[PDB]
Design a protein around this ligand. Structure first.
Ligand SMILES: O=S(=O)(O)c1cccc2cccc(Nc3ccccc3)c12
Ligand SMILES: O=S(=O)(O)c1cccc2cccc(Nc3ccccc3)c12
Ligand code: NA
Ligand code: NA
Ligand code: NA
Lengths: 156, 156
């Protein structure tokens, strides 16, 4: 099944900057997120369809995660990617899609919509703790990008 | 002369957690700020009076900022440091101090109480543009430390 969850967020950063920075995620992520060590393109040019291998550490152990870039829609400052392999897909999970869409906020910032689509195998539902973890990672990635823009204002 | 300015910024991060990040600047600053590559203690043991060097590489050229730790008060979630030399000190400034102390805020978050203390040479008043930069830097770094914490939720 597919189970969809939407959360509304804010940023003091304007949306075109966050959008441009979201596209440098491969460079930003290992800098800001301690446990992300590398991001390598397996296939593709960085746009939709691109497969990426992420090397992370969990408890001193190296683990590998696979991401796919799904779609980008610059018109709506929208960037979608999915987790397609590794530890975040327990046996009853097929894939998890993380969508981000941004609009201008009331004071030079942004209003964001973070959508999590949790794809299960057959009849299964998302485990509640797995959904919690997934939402945390998706928002954490958004906050890594935002934090990088806040710390490096001349770059966007 | 000395000229001082207060502001308050809210954070969703609870103060003990946010404070732990404030005290870990030597590790965090090179992670968040692209051009800051390392922090070296020049004199002292890390507490008040410690002099630190932030090593920067900007467009290929090595530079530094010098910091002095002014006060650390864990009980009241306070971490104060000064820029005392190098590229972050304008030629018209003697010293610029960035004070941060946290109090409990709404929803188990924090309010960061920021003070900028701008020390001029002799009888001059602060350069208005440098005051602007100093205020923006103080807020921007608070928001970026916060962002690092929100991007790394396990580390806390
Ligand atoms: O967990 S995942 O579902 O792949 C995941 C989901 C959504 C966004 C992610 C961004 C970076 C790294 C991931 N993996 C990761 C794993 C461990 C530590 C830090 C990051 C992300
Ligand atoms: O370029 S600055 O003028 O400082 C600057 C000005 C205004 C806002 C800033 C926000 C984050 C980082 C900066 N720079 C920074 C540079 C080195 C160390 C720490 C902060 C900001
Ligand atoms: Na790193
Ligand atoms: Na890292
Ligand atoms: Na750096």
């Amino acid at each position: 099944g597919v189970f969809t969850f939407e959360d509304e967020i804010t940023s003091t950063v304007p949306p075109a900057k966050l959008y441009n920075a979201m596209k440098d995620a491969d460079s930003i992520t290992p800098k800001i997120i301690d446990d992300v060590k590398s991001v390598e393109i397996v296939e593709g040019n960085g746009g939709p369809g691109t497969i990426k291998k992420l090397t992370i550490v969990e408890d001193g152990e190296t683990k590998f995660i696979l991401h796919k870039v799904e779609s980008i829609d610059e018109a709506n400052y929208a960037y979608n990617y999915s987790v397609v392999g590794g530890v975040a897909l327990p046996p009853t999970a097929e894939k998890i899609t993380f969508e981000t869409k941004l609009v201008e906020g009331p004071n030079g910032g942004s209003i964001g919509k973070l959508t999590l689509k949790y794809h299960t195998k057959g009849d299964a539902k998302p485990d509640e703790e797995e959904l919690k973890k997934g939402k945390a990672k998706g928002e954490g990635l958004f906050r890594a990008i935002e934090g990088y823009v806040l710390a490096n204002p001349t770059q966007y």
